[PDB]
Amino acid sequence: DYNLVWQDEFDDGIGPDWVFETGMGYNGWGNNELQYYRRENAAVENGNLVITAKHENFGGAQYTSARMKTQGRKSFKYGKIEARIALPSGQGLWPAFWMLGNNITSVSWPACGEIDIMSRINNALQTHGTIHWSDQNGDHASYGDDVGVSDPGQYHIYSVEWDANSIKWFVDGQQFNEVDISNGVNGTGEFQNEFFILLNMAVGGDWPGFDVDQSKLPAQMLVDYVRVYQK
């Protein structure tokens, strides 16, 4: 049986387990992204975390947004990891709810492993669920799928169920992807370690492309809560 082990409900403020990232990382957070992250772009309104992407000139970038992680504060080995999220739509927008291995600090990416619980680009009427890792040959590996979401601007539940043998993805309880990780098959051993959680909204990058509909800015990603259950 799944029992609640951690949550952030965003009742009146951002909880104690989040660290905010700033700037453009290395080569636009490794994806040629166009936003400069700032603390100012994350706030709480009416029981939701609000991450706002803005058309705003700052530090050589023309967009600002927020990126938050639980690294060094909260991490999990296995569980049902989920969030209740409403998404804005617009060419260039790239929201995500995801996880990275704690060992990123020693083995780097993608060897640390990455679980993308939800990602979306532009105005797509679908969302994605993906893993990234370093396979048995030491090569960058990825495995993903997508599911139709009629109105991503409404709230939906995005989750993964992760155990020693598999990762399963769901939107509103509907499974749309599964990966076998049992005994570290296909060099997936890295998914047997602790992972921390991230939330962000990028603007532009390799995946969504470099055209941005600035008439959709400021754009708000609404996160009602993040919850983690374990059995």
Annotated binding site: 9, 47, 224
Residue from the set 78, 176, 207, 225 that interacts with Cl ion by CB under 5 A:
78
The tokens describing 126, both together, are 């679908």
Residues annotated in a binding site for Ca(2+): 9, 47, 224
Please enumerate in sequence order all residues whose Cβ is within 8 A of that of 108, keeping only pairs 6 or more positions apart, or say none.
none
Smallest distance from Ca ion to CB 87, Å: 16
**166 in Cβ contact with 181 (< 8 Å):** yes
Are residues 147 and 126 in contact, defined by beta-carbon separation less than 8 angstroms? yes
Q: Which span sits near Mg ion by CB under 5 A: 87-95, 146-154, 200-208, 215-223?
A: 146-154
Which of Cl ion, Ca ion, Mg ion, none does residue 154 bind (CB under 5 to 8 Å by kind)?
A: Mg ion
Q: Compose the 27-66 pattern: x for residues touching Cl ion by CB under 5 A, - for all others.
A: ----------------------------------------
Distance CA 223, CA 97 (A): 10
Which partner in Mg ion, Cl ion, Ca ion, none is near 10 (CB below 5 to 8 A by kind)? Ca ion
For residue 87, give the nearest of 227, 224, 220 by alpha carbon: 220
Tell me how far, at minimum, the Cβ of 71 lies from Ca ion, in Å.
22
CB 210, CB 202: distance < 8 Å? no
Hey, what are 102's tokens? 């704690």
The residue at minimum Cβ distance from Ca ion is 47
* Count of C-beta atoms within a 10 Å radius of residue 173: 7
Are the CB atoms for 161 and 76 separated by under 8 Å?
no
Q: Which of 58, 78, 143, 155 binds Mg ion (CB under 5 A)?
A: 155
Stretch that binds Ca ion, among 10-18, 174-182, 199-207, 211-219 (CB under 5 A): 10-18
Q: Which stretch binds Ca ion (CB under 5 A): 9-17, 129-137, 157-165, 200-208?
A: 9-17
Q: Counting contacts by CB under 5 A, is residue 231 touching Cl ion? A: yes
